[PDB]
C-alpha cells in the first residue's frame, strides 16, 4: 500500500550555516470512489465493506398477475 496511498518528497534548502533537509509524507484518503485514483480498499487494515438489509413481513397468500 505504500506505493499507492502515500506520496513522499525531499527538498534541500540552504542557509548561511549548512544545509537543512525537508521531507514531507502525506497520505491519500480516497476509498469510496473517484477519481478513481488510488484503489478503493483500505490500506493497512483491509476492511470488510458491509451493506445491510433485513426485513420480512411474509404470510401466505396468492397474488395473481
Amino acid at each position: 500500500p505504500v506505493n499507492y496511498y502515500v506520496d513522499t518528497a525531499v527538498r534541500h534548502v540552504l542557509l548561511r550555516q549548512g544545509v537543512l533537509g525537508i521531507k514531507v509524507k502525506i497520505m491519500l484518503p480516497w476509498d469510496p470512489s473517484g477519481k478513481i485514483g488510488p484503489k478503493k480498499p483500505l490500506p493497512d487494515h483491509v476492511s470488510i465493506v458491509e451493506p445491510k438489509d433485513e426485513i420480512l413481513p411474509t404470510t401466505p397468500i396468492s397474488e395473481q398477475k
Binding site: 420480512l56 411474509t58 404470510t59 401466505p60 397468500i61 396468492s62 397474488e63 395473481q64 398477475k65
Partner: protein, 313 residues
C-alpha cells in the same frame, strides 16, 4: 402393507451427491452428479452383493456439477455447473455436442423440456434464461426476476400450454408463461429461503419447501394456497411419485415418505445408525428421485453414497 426395506447402497464417488435422475426409457440406467466434478452413468445389476457398478464417467468441469437431467430419449444428458456453463452430453461414449456460454456466476438449476427444444437455467446471476438446443439464447429474464439467487426452475407438464415454475431465495415462487414472459402469479409464503420446488406429473400443483422445511401446496391455475404441513427442520429436495399420490421429503437424518390421501406419514427411512458425534451423526440427505417402476427410490447423501430402498408389501 406397503412399507420399505433397505435394498442396498452404491459406491463410486469422491464428492457429495448433488442430484440423481433416471429416464423412464431405460430404468436400467441411472445417472448421478457430484462435487467430484463428474457425472457418473451406472450399470445396474440387481444382485444384492452390490447393486450396480459405474459404466463410464463423464469428465470435464472446473467446479461442482449442481444438477443434471436426462433427455426424453435417454440418448442425451445435460448438466448445470458452478463454473457458469452447461454441457450437452452424448451419453454413448462422451464427446460433448455443445457447451453453452454465457453467465457471470453459477448455474444452480437446469431442466430439459418434453419436446426437447427448450432448456432453462437458474443462476446466482439472479436471472432465469432460456436456451435453444443449438446453444444460443432464445430469451433472457431480467425483468420481474428474483432479487436473490434462483434456487430451482421446472418445466410443467400440461395439456399443451407453456408454463414454467421459478423459485428463488427471496421467499417467493413465480410462475411464468411463455410468449409474453410475464408473471402468471406470485406466491408468498415460507419464512427463510427456498431450496426446491417440484411439479405433479399431472401438473396443477407446486410442492415447495426451503429453510422453513414446511411443505406448502399451491395451485397452478386456480392460484390458491391449499395448506401447509410441518416437514421437519429443512427439506432440500422433493419428488412426487409417478404411480401414486405420495410425496417424498428429504430431511437430514431421515427421508419422510408422505401419503397425500389422507395426509399422513407412511414411514421414515432410517439408514445406518453407526455411532458418531455430534453435528450430523448420519450424513444429511440432499437429493432423491423415484424410479419409473415406483418400487425403488434412490437418495443422495454427503458421504458420497447413493442408498437404495424398495417397497415391500
Amino acid at each position: 402393507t406397503e412399507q420399505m426395506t433397505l435394498r442396498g447402497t452404491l459406491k463410486g464417488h469422491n464428492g457429495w451427491v448433488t442430484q440423481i435422475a433416471t429416464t423412464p426409457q431405460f430404468p436400467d440406467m441411472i445417472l448421478s452428479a457430484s462435487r467430484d466434478k463428474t457425472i457418473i452413468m451406472w450399470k445396474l445389476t440387481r444382485d444384492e452383493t452390490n447393486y450396480g457398478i459405474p459404466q463410464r464417467a463423464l469428465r470435464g468441469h472446473s467446479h461442482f456439477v449442481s444438477d443434471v437431467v436426462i433427455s426424453s430419449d435417454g440418448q442425451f444428458a445435460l448438466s448445470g455447473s458452478w463454473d457458469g456453463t452447461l454441457r450437452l452430453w452424448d451419453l454413448t461414449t462422451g464427446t460433448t455436442t455443445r457447451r453453452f456460454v454465457g453467465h457471470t456466476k453459477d448455474v444452480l438449476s437446469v431442466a430439459f423440456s418434453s419436446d426437447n427444444r427448450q432448456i432453462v437455467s437458474g443462476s446466482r446471476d439472479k436471472t432465469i434464461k432460456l436456451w435453444n438446443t443449438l446453444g444460443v439464447c432464445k430469451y433472457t429474464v431480467q425483468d420481474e426476476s428474483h432479487s436473490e439467487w434462483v434456487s430451482c426452475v421446472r418445466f410443467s407438464p400440461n395439456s399443451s400450454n407453456p408454463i414454467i415454475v421459478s423459485c428463488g431465495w427471496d421467499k417467493l415462487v413465480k410462475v411464468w408463461n411463455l410468449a409474453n414472459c410475464k408473471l402468471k402469479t406470485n406466491h408468498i409464503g415460507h419464512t427463510g429461503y427456498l431450496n426446491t420446488v417440484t411439479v405433479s406429473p399431472d401438473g396443477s400443483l407446486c410442492a415447495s419447501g426451503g429453510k422453513d422445511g414446511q411443505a406448502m401446496l399451491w395451485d397452478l391455475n386456480e392460484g390458491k394456497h391449499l395448506y401447509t404441513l410441518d416437514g421437519g427442520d429443512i427439506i432440500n429436495a422433493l419428488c412426487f411419485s409417478p404411480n401414486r399420490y405420495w410425496l417424498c421429503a428429504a430431511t437430514g437424518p431421515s427421508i419422510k415418505i408422505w401419503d397425500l390421501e389422507g395426509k399422513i406419514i407412511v414411514d421414515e427411512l432410517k439408514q445406518e445408525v453407526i455411532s458418531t458425534s455430534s453435528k450430523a451423526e448420519p450424513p444429511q440427505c440432499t437429493s432423491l428421485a423415484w424410479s419409473a417402476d415406483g418400487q425403488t427410490l434412490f437418495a443422495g447423501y454427503t458421504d458420497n453414497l447413493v442408498r437404495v430402498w424398495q417397497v415391500t408389501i
